[PDB]
Amino acid sequence: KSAYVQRGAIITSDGVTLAESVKQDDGTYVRNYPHDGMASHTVGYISTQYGTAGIESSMNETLTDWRSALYSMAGINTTGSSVVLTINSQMQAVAEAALQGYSGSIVVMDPSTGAVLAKASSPSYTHAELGTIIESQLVDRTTQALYSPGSSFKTVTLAAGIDTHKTTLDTTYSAPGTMEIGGGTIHNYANEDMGTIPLREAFARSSNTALAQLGVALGADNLVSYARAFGYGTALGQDFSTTPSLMPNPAEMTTWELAWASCGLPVGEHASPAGPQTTVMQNAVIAAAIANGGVVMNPYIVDRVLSPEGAVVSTTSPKSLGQAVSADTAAQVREAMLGVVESGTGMGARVPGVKIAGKTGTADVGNFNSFFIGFAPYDHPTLVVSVVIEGNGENVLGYGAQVGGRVLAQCLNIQAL
Ligand SMILES: *C(=O)[C@@H](NC(=O)c1c(-c2ccccc2Cl)noc1C)[C@@H]1N[C@@H](C(=O)O)C(C)(C)S1
C-alpha cells in the first residue's frame, strides 16, 4: 500500500533537495535523488539488496482508521513530512572535493551545537549505482568504521592530564627515541631523541615516549573515564547511527597497553575490546568539546521537520553529553593544539591570515592512515573538522592536516557569505 503514499523530501540547510518522491501515472511514487552522489551515505537509501542507511532509514518513520482499507485513498489523505538537514551543500561539496582520489572521510561540525555541516565518506556511490551490482563504497567511514586514532588521541590524554592537575603545558618530559615502559618498548616516530622538552612541545611534535609517560601517570581508570566523558562508549548522533568508539575495561589493562593506548594505539589482549578504536565523528566530537569550553555536544544532522505544505513540525535542540573537562583545561588544550599547527606536525594545515589549531596523527594499519582534528578560528571557533585519509598502498603522511586546513579555510569563507 505504501508505494501510493508520497514520501517526504530530504533537503539541505541551504535549500538543495537531495531526495524526493515523484508521482507515477500508475498512482505509485518513485524515489528520485537530485544531485545524485552528494552526501550519499548521509541521505541514504532503502534497498533490498544493499540494506537501509542514512536519513532514509533513521527518519523513515517521519518521511513515511477507515480509509486505510482503500488503496485508492492512500494518495489523498497523508503525505510524508520533509527533513531539512544541518548539512550545507557548499561545505559538503568542499569536503567531497577534498577526498577525490582518496579513501577516508571528513566531518565538519559546529562546535557550539554539534550540528553536522558536512559529512563525507570516500569512495562513494550514486543511487543510480545501487540498481546494479557493486561491492568498500557503501561503508560510511564517518560513522560506521572504526580506526586506530593514533596520535590524534593524545588530545584526550593531554586533556585528562591537565584536568586531573597532574601536569601542565610547561612541565618537562624526557622524550627519548626509545623507552622501556611496562616491560615493553615505546618509540618516537623514527626513533627521534628529542631530549627533555615541555609538554606543549612533546604534544606539538607528537612524541610517543613523552605522552605515554603521561598516560602511565594518569592510569587506566582516568584514561578510560576521560575517553568516555568525551563520548567513547556512546552511539553518537541524536538522529543518525554512529558505532560507539571503544576503550578497554580499565581493570583488564596492563601498563604497556596503557602506554600505547595513551598514544592512540590499541594493543590490548583481554576479554574487553582493545582501544582506543574511534570513528571520525567521535574525533570531531572531541575537537568540538575542546573548542566549546569542554562541553561535549551530541551531534545531529536534522535541523527541522517540515509538514507537506511547508510548516515547521519540529526543530532539533542541541543537547549536551556533559562537561568532559573544565573550561580552564579546554583553553590549555586549545593552546597546545595551536602549537601543533604553528610549529609542530600540523603545519600543513596552516592557512595564511587565519589561526587554525589541531592535532594530527598517523597509525600503522605496510599501510597507514593519516588523521587530523582541528578547529577555527583559534579565538572564538566556529568550525571543527575531523579527517581520516587511508593510505592503502600509498604513503599519506601529513595528508589529513593538509586536507583539514583546506576544508576549514573554504568552509570559513562559506560561513562568511
Ligand atoms: C602518532 O600518531 C605517532 N605515530 C607514530 O609514531 C607511528 C609509528 C611508530 C614508529 C615506531 C614505533 C612506534 C610507532 Cl606508533 N609508525 O607509524 C606512525 C608514524 C606520531 N604522530 C604522527 C603525526 O602526528 O601524524 C607522527 C608522524 C609525527 S609520529
CATH label of the domain that carries residue 35: 3.90.1310.10
Residue type, 368: F
Range of the domain at 183: 86-123+135-302+317-417
**Residue 296 in contact with residue 231, Cβ under 8 Å?**
yes
- Alpha-carbon distances, residue 130 vs 53, 105, 207, 347 (angstroms): 12, 21, 45, 40
Ligand 1 centre and the CA of 274: distance in Å? 18
Q: Phi-psi category of 58—alpha, beta or left, where left has phi over 0 and alpha has psi -120 to 50? A: alpha
- DSSP SS3 for 360: strand
Residue carrying C-alpha cell 590524554: 157
Q: Whose CA is nearest to atom 8 of ligand 1?
A: 189
Evaluate whether residue 168 is within a structural domain.
yes
Q: Where do the DSSP E strands lie in 287-406?
A: 295-297, 302-306, 312-315, 320-323, 357-364, 368-376, 383-390
Mark whether 338 and 323 lie in a shared domain.
yes
Q: 204: how many CB neighbours lie within 10 A of its CB?
A: 24
Mark whether 201 and 128 lie in a shared domain.
no
* Whether the CB of 6 sits within 6 Å of ligand 1: no
Mark whether 270 and 281 lie in a shared domain.
yes
The C-alpha atoms of residue 345 and residue 339 are separated, in whole angstroms, by 9
Q: Whose CA is nearest to atom 5 of ligand 1?
A: 189
Q: Which residues of 151-165 are buried (b: 16+ CB within 10 A; e: fewer)?
A: bbbbbbbbbbbbbbe
The C-alpha atoms of residue 325 and residue 93 are separated, in whole angstroms, by 34
Domain containing 372 — which CATH number?
A: 3.40.710.10
Given 282, 316, 350, the domain boundary residue is 316
Helix H or strand E encompassing 266:
none
Exposed (0-12), middle (13-18) or buried (19+): which is 147, by Cβ within 10 Å?
A: buried
Ligand 1 closest atom vs CA 260: 15
* Whether the CB of 364 sits within 6 Å of ligand 1: yes
Mark whether 186 and 290 lie in a shared domain.
yes
Ligand 1 closest atom vs CA 364: 17
Evaluate whether residue 204 is within a structural domain.
yes
The C-alpha atoms of residue 298 and residue 173 are separated, in whole angstroms, by 35
Ligand 1 centre and the CA of 341: distance in Å? 17
Pocket residue to mutate for ligand 1, from 189, 191, 347, 369, most atoms within 8 A of Cβ: 189
* Whether the CB of 177 sits within 6 Å of ligand 1: no
Given 276, 294, 316, the domain boundary residue is 316
The C-alpha atoms of residue 52 and residue 372 are separated, in whole angstroms, by 30
Evaluate whether residue 224 is within a structural domain.
yes
**Residue 195 in contact with residue 221, Cβ under 8 Å?**
no
The C-alpha atoms of residue 81 and residue 27 are separated, in whole angstroms, by 19
Elucidation method: X-ray
Closest CA to 263 of 187, 331, 201, 325: 187
Ligand 1 centre and the CA of 363: distance in Å? 6
Pocket residue to mutate for ligand 1, from 147, 148, 151, 263, most atoms within 8 A of Cβ: 151
**Phi, psi dihedral angles at 207 (to 5 degrees):** -75, 125
Closest CA to 289 of 246, 233, 346, 227: 227
Closest CA to 326 of 247, 226, 231: 226
Ligand 1 closest atom vs CA 154: 1
Closest CA to 332 of 384, 271, 385, 290: 290
Closest CA to 155 of 87, 223, 99, 92: 223
Supply 129's cell numbers: 549505482
Mark whether 143 and 43 lie in a shared domain.
no
Ligand 1 centre and the CA of 166: distance in Å? 25
Ligand 1 closest atom vs CA 368: 17
* Whether the CB of 150 sits within 6 Å of ligand 1: yes
* Whether the CB of 155 sits within 6 Å of ligand 1: no
Ligand 1 centre and the CA of 212: distance in Å? 12
Mark whether 343 and 310 lie in a shared domain.
no
> Resolution (in Å) of the shown entry?
1.9
Supply 409's cell numbers: 579555510
